[PDB]
Write a protein that binds this ligand. Structure first.
Ligand SMILES: Nc1nc2c(ncn2[C@@H]2O[C@H](COP(=O)(O)OP(=O)(O)OP(=O)(O)O)[C@@H](O)[C@H]2O)c(=O)[nH]1
Ligand SMILES: [Mg+2]
Lengths: 166, 679, 339, 183
């Protein structure tokens, strides 16, 4: 009966809480309130193995924010997030990974990268290709995602558990 | 700087490792971050042993802040899981030193290490996973007892998946984790509502598996439940190594242990070993028929080679555990020990002699006189001379009989190659002889001292000849003592290696100082007073300081000029290190030679106060500390003489106590404040 | 109640010695508190603000770029109510402006939020800042002159404030959109800036200052011909028949390179003719009372207090949890309130 | 005011000190302690090509004579730290040995027998290049100490036999001490 802790980091107003609450509960409308440590829990199975996820939905880190010490001591996963509707999110997410690697040393830590708000075609400015190449350059996985589809976010949290499996 | 300690670090990857680690601790104290992090990281990946030595050297020496505890944890999680041993042990030991960092992620950390460790004991993976997890659980239980005890319910429901798995190295480990947690249980259950569910669970699991691969594991668990359930007999075991809910079932485990012993004696030599640790332990729990089968099993195993060096310990611990019934087998057992000792492992023979003598009492004596001339024929072991100390002390009629031969042994070593001399000299000082003949030994120790290109004969000959001269009235002892001290003290000033120069001078006690008071000896000590090494100077100022009563005409002038040189160093050297060392030495000079200072109270005290008033001695904390420490001692000596200055100091000190920007260890400031007010 | 308690605990840290590590944490909380309160935040101002500004002067530059980001955040929620402390703020900004991309970015974003806060009131504090602004355009080592772009984007927002100081500030703007060397993006921003300023100032004095360089830009660089026309068009709109002098002179470049804007052509023709228009995590720390020594019970307490802070429905306590772990007396003191 | 850690000025200022000392003579002793903080800062760390700044300052210190009396305990340690340390470029190291030789002719060294002798002994072992130089320092130091040297004779002898070293000056004086009749 395995138990895994997962940290969703990123820039703010991207959709960390939007995804996290979609996976855990399954509702289109979500808390439009800036969160400080919104923890969650969920029961799911991945290839027969029982996994209790404990999801740390963190407060969104800006360009300068000194990186927390709760996350360098506990966690078997990081879902680093950007939103496809700004370049802002993408420059920020590069530096989060910067500081995160400065925080833990450089060990083979289970990461992925996530592009939220794919449903927004008409406000999109980042492409599938850039983030795929950035993910590939870190030795990390990629997905695009949508808080509007519980189906997609399910596939995300499955991916990170499979990365930490390795 | 960084590349220098990097060359040292990559050198520690290839005794040299631990030496370079001690240097790393000294360099971190002298203080940069990321260069040494990158250095550790790149020694980590390939070599791994050095990574652990460095990680362990920096935990606590820095004042390890949270950025260290974030990294070090994540390094040590990718040493253990998939490994090959030795590295494994030192990784979990380093988790031991780390999980008692002090930072408030200790609950978070230890919750994580333990939950992960118990997940490796929930599916038979790589038996290195088991090896790892269990070594982690053991070391966290010892180092961090609170947070480990917090996770006890899954723990006792997950080691009995994992003593039983088919392995030899796991068994010792998985019972060591159980040993640590059951030592936590001993200190808790007096206060909890009712008695626990645990001891029953332990005994019942051991019994389920007991009823080849499963015997050894069951017997190790019994070794534990017997350890906890009678805290008396283990003391006995530990004592020889230096040189109540089981009460319900104690016949079940007895019948179980002896039956399985004789009926797996010609199978394995593992299971035999754990039986030779139960029988002495269960004998001390409840003292006829069992004892004959016991001693027949044990004494048959002493002729056979594998178990012999354990069989002696069992034979010894049984001679305490049941004294009276053992007195039948002394004619049998002394033949065994006799046959063990005609000269050429043998240590345990000597421990059995100590217990055999200790336990039953002084009614062997003449038989042990027949044992003594054998024991001495072995030569000089560390074990032997330790036993002969124990034996002389406990059986007092053999006080003279021991030392008769033991000297004309030692004499035969030091009339008539190298590493033996060290232990011979250590013996010569370290237990009490009743011969005047020692006067020849001390004068022959002039040979060992002067020569010996080997460092260790010198450093030990020193530590001997100080100890032997304690008869320091009549005119033969006096000339000898004085003749030695000259040669002895010469080495203390002159010898090239600092360590001998320290040792010699430190050993020149208050016992001698009426010989140190002579002009010539004193001229030499003053040379020490301005040595190359700082620690030696600190020592010599104390020494000369003691003598300033004894022969004041020589001393007091020298000490005055020393005082002037000291105050000059304080005012006029711009270097911090020099001022720090200066004030520190002034501390000693004040406390030690009070008669000298009490006239020069005002000057000293002004010069000291004026350090505290300056704005730019903040780049070194130790100037301000050692200045305050001195004011403490200066206060002690003065007394009312230093009344008018107290208000000035009091403002200064209380201003330091609040707002620690002038960050003295408040320990020192509070101490001084206390001292002023006291004096 | 809740915001008031948190504010007092936070500010008790917010005084040198403990902040050596935990500045950032405190300020992140505060900013979240005010964000959450609305305009009822205003009551805490005189507690926070004097300490806050003194922190900036005292602290190390490791932090300092962050504090200004968050100061500008306080400014935005509070809006005009910050006016009493504005002197000190401007003194701080004036002290910590240097010719380095590092700080300048953030300080300029601060100005952006001050202007919108004070509105008409900013006009007073403007001249303390003009010496620095003119020093930015005059010389700047920024990659692609982006510092000066952001400052242009700030100047866009000054509106009627800029009235009394346009004669200072308009020349160096013009010197961007005329000079050949200047990288195209900066140059564009300067043209678009003059377009914004036209909607809320008068340009009748500076017809000759602006028009001749636009005319020059139309010739030299073909890339900005659309952009510059959209500046000029609006400038014409604002001038009205005062433009009648320039029509022919400008026309002689408009025919040269065959340039067509609806907006321009319309207005010229129009001038000449004359007619313009929550509990599952808590439950672990409640009855975990299987405890026996001092350390065992204290650690029950610690974990309980923090477990409370995470839950607590009030945002102004939630905020602190982050800090409450890293500094434990924050949890200690909020314990009762948290509970 | 105008002392800095730069070869540029230091050279000249040190030449100034050289001319002041000879000017004032006995009087310089008063003004010395205002300058010691700078002098110790020169030896402690110096970026000079081949440490020549510190050579010139050694060559200055050679001239202080009896002035240096009250401050030898300050100034003798960093001098010693040159002639012991492995890294130091040979010319500087030589000057420091020759400096202690000069100072012996116009100060007392009885306090600092142990400070000086042990490093000389060390230098005799490690580097063979300065064996003549260091012997000529030691010889003079022995001359100045007199029978106070009697302690050290054997200890030093054990390196003097090891590398087979012969100085008239040294051998003469040791034999002269043991028998007891100095000129
Ligand atoms: N329309 C639409 N909106 C989305 C989608 N994904 C996320 N969002 C919106 O993103 C907005 C901001 O995200 P939040 O979840 O509030 O903020 P956050 O990412 O948790 O970051 P913090 O504020 O730092 O906690 C929300 O108002 C969501 O409605 C999507 O697929 N479609
Ligand atoms: Mg959120």
């Amino acid at each position: 009966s395995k138990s895994r802790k997962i940290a969703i980091l990123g820039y703010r107003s991207v959709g960390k809480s939007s995804l996290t609450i979609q996976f855990v509960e399954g509702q289109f409308v979500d808390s439009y309130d800036p969160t400080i440590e919104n923890t969650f829990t969920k029961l799911i199975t991945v290839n027969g193995q029982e996994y209790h996820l404990q999801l740390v939905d963190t407060a969104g880190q800006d360009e300068y924010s000194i990186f927390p010490q709760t996350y360098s001591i506990d966690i078997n996963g990081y879902i680093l997030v950007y939103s496809v509707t700004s370049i802002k999110s993408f420059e920020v997410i590069k530096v989060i990974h910067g500081k995160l690697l400065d925080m833990v040393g450089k060990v083979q830590i289970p990461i992925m990268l996530v592009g939220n708000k794919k449903d927004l075609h008409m406000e999109r400015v980042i492409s599938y290709e850039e983030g795929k190449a950035l993910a590939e350059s870190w030795n990390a996985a990629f997905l695009e995602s949508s808080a509007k589809e519980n189906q997609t976010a399910v596939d995300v949290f499955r991916r990170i558990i499979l990365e930490a499996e390795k | 700087x960084x590349x220098x300690x990097x060359x040292x670090x990559x050198x520690x990857x290839x005794x040299x490792x631990x030496x370079x680690x001690x240097x790393x601790x000294x360099x971190x104290x002298x203080x940069x971050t990321r260069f040494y992090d990158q250095l550790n990281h790149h020694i980590f990946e390939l070599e791994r042993k050095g990574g652990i030595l460095a990680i362990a050297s920096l935990i606590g020496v820095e004042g390890g802040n949270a950025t260290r505890i974030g990294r070090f944890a994540n390094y040590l999680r990718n040493l253990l899981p998939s490994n090959d041993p030795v590295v494994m042990e030192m990784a979990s030991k380093a988790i031991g030193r780390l999980a008692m960092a002090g930072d408030t992620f200790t609950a978070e950390y230890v919750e994580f290490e333990v939950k992960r460790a118990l997940e490796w004991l929930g599916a038979d993976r790589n038996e290195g996973r088991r090896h790892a997890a269990v070594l982690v659980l053991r070391e966290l239980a010892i180092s961090v007892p609170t947070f480990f005890f917090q996770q006890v319910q899954p723990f006792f429901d997950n080691i009995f998946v994992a003593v039983w798995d088919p392995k030899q190295a796991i068994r010792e480990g998985a019972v060591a984790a159980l040993r640590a947690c059951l030592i936590l249980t001993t200190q808790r259950e007096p206060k909890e509502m009712q008695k626990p569910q645990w001891y029953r669970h332990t005994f019942e699991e051991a019994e389920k598996g007991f009823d080849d691969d499963r015997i050894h594991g069951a017997l190790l668990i019994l070794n534990e439940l017997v350890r906890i359930s009678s805290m008396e007999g283990e003391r006995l075991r530990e004592e020889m190594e230096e040189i109540x809910x089981x009460x319900x079932x104690x016949x079940x485990x007895x019948x179980x242990x002896x039956x399985x012993x004789x009926x797996x004696x010609x199978x394995x030599s593992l299971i035999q070993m754990t039986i030779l640790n139960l029988l002495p332990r269960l004998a001390a729990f409840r003292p006829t028929q069992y004892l004959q089968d016991t001693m027949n099993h044990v004494l048959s195993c002493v002729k056979k080679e594998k178990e012999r060096t354990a069989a002696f310990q069992a034979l010894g611990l049984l001679s305490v555990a049941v004294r009276s019934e053992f007195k039948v087998y002394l004619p049998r057992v002394l033949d065994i020990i006799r046959a063990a000792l005609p000269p050429k492992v043998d240590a345990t023979v000597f421990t059995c002699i100590s217990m055999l003598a200790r336990a039953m009492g002084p009614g062997i004596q003449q038989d042990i006189k027949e044992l003594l001339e054998p024991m001495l024929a072995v030569g000089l072991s560390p074990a032997l001379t330790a036993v002969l100390y124990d034996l002389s002390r406990q059986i007092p009629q053999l006080k003279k009989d021991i030392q008769d031969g033991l000297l004309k042994m030692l004499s035969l070593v030091l009339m008539x190659x190298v590493g033996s001399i060290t232990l011979a000299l250590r013996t010569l000082g370290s237990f009490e002889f009743e011969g005047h003949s020692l006067t020849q030994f001390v004068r022959h120790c002039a040979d060992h001292f002067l020569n010996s290109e080997h460092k260790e004969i010198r450093m030990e000959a020193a530590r001997t000849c100080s100890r032997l001269l304690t008869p320091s009235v009549s005119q033969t002892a006096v000339q000898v003592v004085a003749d030695v001290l000259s040669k002895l003290l010469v080495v203390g000033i002159t010898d090239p290696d600092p360590d001998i120069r320290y040792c010699v001078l430190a050993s020149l006690d208050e016992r001698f100082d009426a010989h140190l008071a002579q002009a010539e000896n004193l001229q030499a000590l003053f040379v020490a007073l301005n040595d190359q090494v700082f620690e030696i100077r600190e020592l010599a100022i104390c020494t000369v300081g003691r003598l300033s009563s004894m022969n004041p005409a020589f001393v007091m002038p020298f000490l005055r000029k020393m005082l002037i040189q000291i105050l000059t160093e304080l005012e006029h050297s711009g270097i911090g290190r020099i001022k720090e060392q200066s004030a520190r030495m002034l501390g000693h000079l004040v406390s030690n030679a009070p008669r000298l200072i009490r006239p020069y109270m005002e000057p000293i005290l002004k010069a000291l106060i004026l350090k505290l008033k300056d704005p730019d001695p903040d780049p070194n904390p130790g100037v301000i500390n050692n200045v305050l420490a001195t004011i403490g001692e200066l206060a002690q000596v003065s007394g009312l003489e230093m009344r008018k200055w107290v208000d000035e100091l009091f403002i200064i000190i209380m201003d330091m106590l609040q707002d620690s920007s002038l960050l003295a260890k408040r320990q020192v400031a509070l101490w001084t404040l206390g001292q002023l007010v006291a004096s | 109640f809740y915001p008031a308690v948190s504010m007092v605990a936070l500010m008790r840290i917010f005084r040198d010695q403990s902040l050596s590590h935990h500045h950032t944490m405190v300020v992140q909380a505060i900013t979240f508190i005010f964000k959450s309160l609305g305009l009822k935040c205003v009551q805490f101002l005189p507690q926070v603000m004097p300490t806050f500004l003194n922190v900036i002067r005292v602290c190390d530059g490791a932090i300092r770029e962050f504090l200004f980001q968050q100061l500008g955040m306080l400014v935005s929620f509070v809006k005009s109510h910050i006016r009493p402390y504005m002197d000190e703020i401007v003194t701080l900004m004036r002290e910590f402006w240097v010719m380095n991309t590092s700080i300048q970015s953030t300080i300029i974003l601060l100005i952006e939020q001050i202007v919108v806060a004070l509105g008409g009131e900013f006009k007073l504090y403007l001249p303390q800042l003009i010496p620095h602004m003119l020093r930015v355009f005059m010389h700047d080592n920024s990659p692609g002159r982006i510092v000066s772009i952001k400052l242009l984007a700030a100047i866009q927002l000054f509106g009627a404030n800029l009235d009394d100081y346009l004669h200072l500030l308009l020349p160096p703007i013009v010197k961007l959109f005329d000079a050949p060397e200047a990288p195209l993006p900066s140059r564009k921003a300067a043209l678009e800036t003059v377009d914004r300023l036209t909607e809320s100032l008068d340009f009748t004095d500076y017809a000759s200052r602006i028009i001749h360089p636009i005319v020059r830009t139309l010739d030299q660089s073909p890339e900005l011909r659309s952009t510059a026309m959209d500046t000029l068009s609006s400038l014409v709109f604002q001038l009205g028949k005062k433009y009648q002098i320039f029509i022919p002179m400008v026309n002689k470049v408009l025919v040269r390179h065959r340039i067509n804007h609806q907006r321009y052509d319309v207005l010229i023709c129009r001038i000449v003719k004359g007619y313009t228009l929550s509990t599952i995590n808590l439950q672990k720390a409640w009855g975990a009372a299987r405890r026996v020594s001092k350390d065992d019970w204290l650690e029950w307490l610690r974990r309980l207090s923090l477990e409370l802070l995470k839950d607590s429905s009030s945002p102004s306590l939630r905020s602190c949890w982050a800090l409450a772990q890293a500094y434990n007396p924050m949890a200690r003191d909020l314990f009762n309130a948290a509970f």
